[PDB]
Amino acid sequence: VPHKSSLPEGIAPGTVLAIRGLVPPNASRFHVNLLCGEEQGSDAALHFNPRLDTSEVVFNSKEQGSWGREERGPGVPFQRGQPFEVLIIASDDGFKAVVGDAQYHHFRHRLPLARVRLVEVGGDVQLDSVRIF
Amino acid sequence: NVPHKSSLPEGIAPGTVLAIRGLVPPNASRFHVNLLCGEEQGSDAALHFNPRLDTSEVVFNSKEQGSWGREERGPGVPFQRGQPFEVLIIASDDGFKAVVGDAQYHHFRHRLPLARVRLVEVGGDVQLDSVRIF
């Protein structure tokens, strides 16, 4: 609405963000953001953006209001009308994106993991659960 | 008694009452009741009724040509781990009335025609007492 999960103590290398939901029938795109605070315009360590309308999955970061260079995942492991399960796994050198029990993309840290304070999910998605271990 | 299947080869009409009684067991995540349009796997689902104890929601949806529609949600979750329940799913001309514990809980407008329903399928984390169709 967007969904928000606050992480005031940050997340350590060895953290799993598990997201399950349904991509609805007319979905254009949705996003999962790991933000550095609760304020508007907060920096993004990771912006994860499956785009159903253009058949791409874009990864990016945002720092001081300005976006970095987009990375793209190999293919689109999402489909309108289908449920999904995504793991975003924080490691020492980046985030591992796991979709449907298959390694999908590695996004190397651009901001220090130590700054992440919030997980935000928005867009054309119908959330089943958002869990942080 | 899960997975539980009740064949309705002559279909259902306005005034059909699906009465389901059971227990949500102590470590339950979720269960479902499906009104399916045939016995074959992947049959269209006129109604998918999905109480989720783990996320404290009840989701309603449909399935057509293998792809799900847009989820509808009821208010809260009128189920609890460790508690017995009594659900009526009542077919009218306009939709399915979901009744839980002596009270109207949600109205699901028909997405598929009532006349296509051919099968009830209760499954997931529930310990079924009885499934009756009137």
Listed in sequence order, the DSSP H helices in chain A are none
Residues in B 70-109 with any Cβ partner in A closer than 8 A: 70-71
How far apart CA A48 and CA A59 sit, in angstroms, is 5
Measured CA to CA, the distance from residue B24 to residue B83 in angstroms comes to 6
- Find, among B105, B117, B102, B104, the residue nearest to B16 by Cα: B117
Q: What count of CB pairs under 8 Å joins A to B? A: 26
Interacting residues of B64 by C-beta distance below 8 A, sequence separation 6+: B44, B111, B112
From chain A, pick out residues whose CB is under 8 angstroms from the CB of B70. 24-26, 126
Q: How far apart are CA B32 and CA B36, in angstroms?
A: 12
Q: Give the resolution in Å.
A: 2.0
Residues 6 or more apart whose Cβ sits within 8 Å of residue B7: B39, B118, B119
The dihedrals phi and psi of A41, each to the nearest 5 degrees, come to: 75, 10
Give every strand in the sheet of A83-90, ordered side by side. A102-108, A94-99, A83-90, A15-22, A126-132
Contact A81 B71 (CB under 8 A): no
CB A61 within 8 A of CB A110: yes
Return the closest-CA partner of residue A125 out of A18, A23, A54.
Answer: A23
The answer to whether A92 and A24 have CB atoms below 8 angstroms apart is no
Q: Which of B1, B6, B3, B2 is nearest to B132 (CA)?
A: B6
Is A38 marked as a binding-site residue?
Answer: no
Q: Which of B52, B54, B68 sits opposite A81 (nearest CB)?
A: B68
Measured between alpha carbons, how far is A29 from A56 in angstroms, rounded to an integer? 9
Cα separation, A96 vs A122, whole angstroms: 20
Question: CB of A55 within 8 A of CB of A67?
Answer: no
Contacts of B111 (CB under 8 A, 6+ apart): B46, B62, B64, B69
Q: Which of A22, A78, A80, A85 to mutate to test the interface with B (most CBs of B within 10 A)?
A: A22
B1 touches chain A (CB under 8 A): no
**A118 vs A7: CA distance, rounded Å:** 5
Phi, psi of B83 (to 5 degrees): -125, 140
Residues of chain A found within 8 Å of residue B66, distances taken between Cβ atoms: 81
DSSP characters over A45-77 = EEEEEEETTTTEEEEEEEETTEE---EE-SS--
Structure-determination technique:
X-ray
- Partner A contacted by B32 (CB < 8 A): no
DSSP summary character for residue A93:
S
Tell me, yes or no, if B52 comes closer than 8 A to chain A by beta carbon. Answer: yes
- In this structure, what token pair is assigned to residue B40? 């074959």
As given in the structure block, the two tokens for residue A74 are 């190999």
Q: What are phi and psi of B8, to 5 degrees?
A: -125, 70
Q: What angle do CA B53, B78, B61 make, to 5 degrees?
A: 70
* B19: β partners: B88, B132
Distance CA A57, CA A77 (A): 8
The reply to whether A53 touches chain B by the CB within 8 Å rule is no
Distance set, CA B94 to CA B15, B109, B110 (Å): 11, 6, 6
Domains annotated on chain A, with CATH: 3-132 (2.60.120.200)
Is A41 an 8 Å CB contact of chain B?
A: no
Q: In this complex, do A25 and B67 lie within 8 Å of one another by their Cβ atoms?
A: yes
Test mutation, A128, A129, A130, chain B, max B CBs within 10 A: A128
* A25 in B contact zone (CB under 8 Å): yes
Contact B44, B34 (CB under 8 A): no
